[PDB]
């Protein structure tokens, strides 16, 4: 199977809902694992760019590739060990890093597809139509959905607007690009970034590469830029069946600020991002990473410096724990643009029954 247990850093007295560590350096691997999965795992382990949306697409692509490479054996049938393989892959993924609802949905869809086609049809003809179908699905629930979202944004966003964004959600970046080049509008895009992740920075860079006026913002200096700000979009990850946004980093604070100061908050989301599972706080299900990211002085990601920090077990009780994903409130984000055009966050799972 690989490597299990034996990890640095304590279990911690505060916040221990999920397991904290997993394979990063490859040693003794099974002689049946597809390299693309391994590469993906390697990437995710230390990624800066992707967040929720592109990850799922990547996964889908990988799956497609696997299917293309797969052929029906003489002894075992098409539906004999494929499911087992999928399960193994899932387990590997989980071991690497906790997964999203979209991925789960995709898995479910795949499972359904497996059941649908009966093991009697010609093998070459089977996968030919399968990969086409999967492509079609991808086009529909992602690209077309993105387009729909863009169009929704278009009718709502006024002439000459100031937008404040967080994270590295691809859809928002696409929207901003559209605003810049295709429609041609006056845009002021303020992007906020945190210590361990340089997603905001990346977004800013991307904007620059197009030709947009960008203000770089931080958590320490928030109130100075608001007091002027008209419209705020948040980096969406998943909407729960209560009306709460399970999202990345200090978006909740921003939302609170928005609520305090005049204008309501807006959220752009996909039709398949919705979850039937329910939770109402950050303590419920936390996504964790290694405290090794916050040791060095900032500036850039790879530095390797000698200074003062570099003790987790050496000094007299030192805990340096952080959270990657937090909870955003219910009443504060009201706007939701999805595959079913219009709706609010109070409307929690009306689209879930409609599918």
């Amino acid at each position: 199977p690989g490597i299990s247990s034996v990890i640095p850093t304590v279990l911690e007295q505060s916040f221990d809902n999920s397991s904290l560590i997993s394979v990063k350096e490859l040693l003794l691997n099974k002689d049946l694992i597809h390299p693309s999965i391994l590469l993906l795992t390697s990437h995710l382990a230390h990624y800066k760019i992707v967040g929720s949306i592109p990850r799922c697409i990547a996964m889908l692509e990988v799956f497609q590739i696997v299917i293309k490479d797969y052929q029906t054996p003489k002894g075992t049938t098409l539906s004999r060990n494929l499911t087992s393989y999928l399960s193994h892959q899932i387990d590997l993924l989980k071991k690497a890093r906790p997964l999203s609802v979209t991925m789960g949905n995709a898995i479910r869809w795949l499972k359904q597809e497996i059941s649908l086609i009966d093991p009697s049809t010609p093998d070459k003809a089977a996968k030919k139509d399968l990969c086409e179908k999967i492509g079609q699905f991808a086009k529909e629930k992602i690209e077309l959905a993105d387009q729909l979202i863009i169009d929704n944004a278009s009718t709502q966003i006024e002439e000459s607007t100031t937008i404040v964004t967080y994270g590295s959600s691809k859809v928002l970046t696409e929207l901003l690009l559209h605003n810049a080049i295709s429609l041609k509008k006056n845009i002021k895009v303020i992007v906020v970034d945190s210590r361990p992740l340089f997603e905001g920075r990346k977004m800013a860079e991307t904007l620059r590469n197009a030709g947009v006026n960008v203000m770089y913002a931080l958590i320490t200096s928030l109130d100075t830029i608001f007091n002027d700000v008209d419209y705020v979009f948040l980096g969406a990850h998943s909407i729960l069946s209560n009306g709460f946004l399970y999202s990345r980093a200090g978006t909740a604070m921003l939302a609170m600020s928005a609520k305090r100061r005049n204008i309501p908050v807006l959220v752009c989301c996909e039709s398949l991002k919705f979850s039937q599972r329910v939770q109402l706080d950050s303590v419920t299900f936390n996504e964790l990473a290694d405290p090794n990211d916050l040791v060095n002085i900032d500036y850039e990601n790879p530095v390797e410096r000698r200074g003062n920090k570099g003790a987790l077990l050496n000094q007299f009780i030192k805990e340096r724990k952080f959270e990657k994903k937090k909870l955003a409130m219910e009443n504060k984000p009201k706007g939701n643009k999805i595959g079913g055009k219009k709706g609010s966050e109070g409307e929690s799972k009306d689209a879930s029954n409609e599918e």
Partner: protein, 267 residues
């Protein structure tokens, strides 16, 4: 997807052992442990399944015998003998010959090796950083004149210039276009090349059409130049070589270094 090529030849540079008809360059006892033992260990560590060893005109079955008897191996090793070898041509002519057998990425590792460094981290680096070529340099012997020069970068870690002091003009010369793009260029004197080479998927096209390489160094990493004129057809990721430094005492054998290696081995 994963494969390695093992280079073998004949001892010409060495003075005292190699001129014997029965003793090959691959199978040599230097310090108790055999020469190809270390290489085999490295390969095992690297988790490569299909490894094909290229052989010279001299010794056709001895190498096979070595592979078979005495040594743990537990791997499907194939020993092949191409015809176009003249020596006056080390391995480039072999490389040119064997190209349809390559399915993915290939690693070049000669028969002569003295190794102590961690093997996985080179491979991992090659995989991750999105680069076509990677090479290694190690410190000179510190235990109690004209040598060789190599270029290094420190932050990404890149290689640019690699030419030796054998045949060149009296004054050292640098190009203008090669300096303006990538501004920082650290030149070291102490570092010695261990001749470890990593190759990506897109390398097979150039060898069959236009051969210019000599001793696997002349036209291998230096024709990365996308400057001044651009008159050579590239394969697409831009052509960039890389280099990494290591501390441990492990180097190449060519001159009177064998006797030093003997001294080293016993510790």
């Amino acid at each position: 997807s994963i494969q390695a090529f093992v280079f073998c030849g004949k001892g010409s540079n060495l003075a005292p052992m190699q001129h014997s008809t029965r003793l090959p360059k691959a199978l040599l006892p230097i310090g108790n442990r055999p020469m190809i033992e270390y290489v085999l260990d490295w390969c095992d560590q690297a988790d490569f399944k299909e490894i094909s060893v290229v052989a010279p005109v001299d010794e056709i079955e001895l190498i096979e015998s070595g592979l078979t008897s005495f040594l743990n191996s537990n791997h499907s090793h194939h020993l092949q003998d191409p015809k176009k070898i003249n020596f006056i041509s080390t391995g480039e002519s072999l490389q040119k010959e064997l190209l349809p057998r390559i399915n993915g990425d290939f690693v070049i590792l000669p028969c002569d090796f003295v190794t102590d460094i961690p093997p996985q981290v080179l491979v991992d680096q090659f995989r991750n950083r999105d680069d076509n070529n990677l090479a290694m340099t190690i410190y000179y012997k510190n235990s109690l004149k004209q040598q060789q020069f190599f270029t290094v970068y420190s932050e990404i870690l890149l290689d640019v210039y690699s030419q030796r002091d054998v045949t060149k003009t009296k004054y050292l010369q640098i190009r203008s276009h090669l300096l303006w793009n990538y501004p920082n260029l650290t030149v070291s004197t102490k570092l010695l090349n261990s001749f470890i080479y990593f190759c990506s998927f897109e390398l097979c096209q150039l060898l069959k059409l236009g051969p210019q390489s000599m001793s696997r160094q002349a036209s291998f990493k230096d024709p990365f130049t996308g400057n001044q004129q651009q008159q050579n057809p590239p394969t697409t990721i831009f052509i960039l070589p890389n280099e990494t430094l290591f501390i441990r005492a492990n180097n190449l054998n060519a001159y009177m270094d064998a006797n030093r290696f003997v001294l080293k081995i016993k510790s």
